[PDB]
Design a protein around this nucleic acid. Structure first.
Ligand SMILES: O=c1[nH]cc(CO)c(=O)[nH]1
Length: 196
DNA sequence: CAGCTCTGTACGTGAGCAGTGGACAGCT
DNA sequence: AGCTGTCCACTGCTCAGTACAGAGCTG
């Protein structure tokens, strides 16, 4: 029990999006974990690498935590949402129909607020997104920038290893910070390309 | 064959948990 | 000196996607 709160109550709770217009980066998670539904803030996981990586990469220049997520769009130009809204312990608990439904809601949200870069916090969710939205399944899907903008916009697609610490192939935040740094570089290259 | 899809399986860190016990002050 | 309770350092866990092999297919 999370301070008295049963796991049953948490499964029903949802995590509110934090979206505005003219954002640079929208961090797209998979779906709310237990701690996320409890706190009502994005990536509150004590082990989760998201915030540490936001700092080590200098995307935030100050060590923030989940409580500051609502202050991100104004200050740092970063917004939050997920592929699937339903709260589950994580990943494998969701169905294919749920993910693709989420993708529809997601691609819809993306072409509304249209940020500069749609950041997929997880390879898995982009595999589903790419196949559904772009009708394309590539043998060797790689991290980083993707060949397709979300339809009818100029929003780019950028994929990173999931900030979850369950990922054994990237054991530490140091092992993931590289993709955040190139995300920051991508952002800067886009701001400059526009300012020209 | 060879390719394609889907399922299951295995894998490293480090934060936080309960349990354990050593240090130690306040007693009698 | 012996007793004893609290405190706390430290223990030994557990647990928060991805790559890939192979099986069941199809071409
Ligand atoms: O990739 C991720 N990691 C963690 C979460 C939530 O805790 C999420 O939604 N997506």
């Amino acid at each position: 029990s999370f301070n008295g709160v049963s796991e049953a109550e948490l499964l029903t709770k949802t995590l509110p999006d934090i979206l505005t217009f003219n954002l640079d980066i929208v961090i797209i998670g998979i779906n709310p974990g237990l701690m996320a539904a409890y706190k009502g803030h994005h990536y509150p996981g004590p082990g989760n690498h998201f915030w540490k990586c936001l700092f080590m990469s200098g995307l935030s220049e100050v060590q923030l935590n989940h409580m500051d997520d609502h202050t991100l769009p104004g200050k740092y130009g970063i917004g939050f949402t997920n592929m699937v809204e339903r709260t589950t312990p994580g990943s494998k608990d969701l169905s294919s129909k749920e993910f693709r439904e989420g993708g529809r809601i997601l691609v819809q949200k993306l072409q509304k607020y249209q940020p500069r870069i749609a950041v997929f916090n997880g390879k898995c969710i982009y595999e589903i997104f790419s196949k559904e939205v772009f009708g394309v399944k590539v043998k060797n899907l790689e991290f980083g920038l993707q060949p397709h903008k979300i339809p009818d916009t100029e929003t780019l697609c950028y994929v990173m290893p999931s900030s979850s610490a369950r990922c054994a192939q990237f054991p530490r935040a140091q092992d993931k910070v590289h993709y955040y740094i190139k995300l920051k570089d991508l952002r800067d290259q886009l701001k400059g390309i526009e300012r020209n």
